[PDB]
Amino acid sequence: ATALYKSSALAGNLFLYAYNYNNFTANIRLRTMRYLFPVVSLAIFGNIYWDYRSQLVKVNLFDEYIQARAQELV
Amino acid sequence: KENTGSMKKPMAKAYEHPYNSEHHPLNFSAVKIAETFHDFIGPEQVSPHYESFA
Ligand SMILES: CCCCCCCCCCCCCCCCCC(=O)OC[C@H](COP(=O)([O-])OCC(O)COP(=O)([O-])OC[C@@H](COC(=O)CCCCCCCCCCCCCCCCC)OC(=O)CCCCCCCCCCCCCCCCC)OC(=O)CCCCCCCCCCCCCCCCC
Ligand SMILES: CCCCCCCCCCCCCCCCCC(=O)OC[C@H](COP(=O)([O-])OCC(O)COP(=O)([O-])OC[C@@H](COC(=O)CCCCCCCCCCCCCCCCC)OC(=O)CCCCCCCCCCCCCCCCC)OC(=O)CCCCCCCCCCCCCCCCC
Numbered sequence: 142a143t144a145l146y147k148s149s150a151l152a153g154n155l156f157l158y159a160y161n162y163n164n165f166t167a168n169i170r171l172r173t174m175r176y177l178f179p180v181v182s183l184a185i186f187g188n189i190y191w192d193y194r195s196q197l198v199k200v201n202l203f204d205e206y207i208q209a210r211a212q213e214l215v
Numbered sequence: 216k217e218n219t220g221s222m223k224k225p226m227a228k229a230y231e232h233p234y235n236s237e238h239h240p241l242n243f244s245a246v247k248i249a250e251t252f253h254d255f256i257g258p259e260q261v262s263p264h265y266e267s268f269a
């Protein structure tokens with residue numbers, strides 16, 4: 142749920158840039174947003190995927206241990 | 216002699232900016248923010264009645 146929301150909020154920023162593409166692209170007063178919007182977007186995507194990827198790794202480590210340790214105890 | 220006058224063919228069109236529109240104006244001003252504002256709050260709610268609602 143958290144990964145899906147944060148992904149939708151990131152997609153919301155892409156709409157804000159697309160809805161206002163002509164201004165971010167042609168108006169030089171908004172050049173800093175045109176240049177650094179994708180850097181912030183990647184850093185946000187990285188946090189979203191980093192957490193999902195790390196959580197996924199831990200779940201798999203937990204699952205493979207309880208199965209192995211259980212057979213030893215049997 | 217004046218009645219015999221004619222008219223030259225003018226130019227077809229001037230430059231059309233590919234990044235400025237009436238709904239997405241390139242440059243900013245309080246006039247366009249006002250249009251978007253009065254579209255949000257809507258027009259004046261005129262009452263046709265003879266006494267106030269309250
Ligand atoms: C009380 C009950 C409560 C219910 C809760 C729900 C409340 C209602 C929610 C309303 C807001 C959401 C809108 C949902 C759609 C509703 C339909 C609608 O818009 O109204 C009728 C609307 C007309 O509006 P109107 O009121 O009749 O008159 C408007 C005026 O004429 C003036 O014309 P105009 O065009 O200037 O007007 C624009 C108009 C309509 O603008 C639009 O064009 C509607 C499109 C909005 C898209 C929203 C972003 C979604 C991005 C795409 C995700 C796709 C995912 C799947 C991908 C699959 C493919 C791989 O207003 C908006 O822009 C609404 C924007 C809402 C704010 C969004 C802010 C996001 C940042 C905050 C994030 C918060 C987290 C949640 C974010 C969730 C995002 C998923 O119909 C249309 O606009 C037709 C559009 C036809 C062509 C669309 C082509 C697709 C465009 C996609 C953009 C792509 C962006 C870049 C890619 C991003 C993906 C990576
Ligand atoms: C499960 C069941 C549960 C649900 C059951 C269903 C029940 C749902 C309830 C709905 C009831 C029906 C709704 C009808 C419309 C709203 C009510 C209304 O009075 O509208 C007409 C009323 C005026 O009537 P009018 O004759 O059509 O207007 C003629 C002139 O244009 C007006 O201007 P004028 O100066 O040219 O003419 C004279 C003007 C002179 O008087 C005035 O103009 C009033 C001055 C107020 C403006 C002063 C500046 C303050 C406003 C700044 C904005 C701040 C809010 C926004 C900022 C934050 C963003 C959210 O009006 C008057 O004659 C006296 C005022 C009316 C009597 C006093 C009412 C006081 C309370 C109304 C405001 C609510 C305060 C918050 C309470 C809620 C607590 C959470 O409209 C307003 O003044 C503002 C309405 C906003 C009301 C929002 C709250 C709605 C809930 C209503 C429930 C009843 C109040 C409960 C509070 C109890 C505290 C003691």
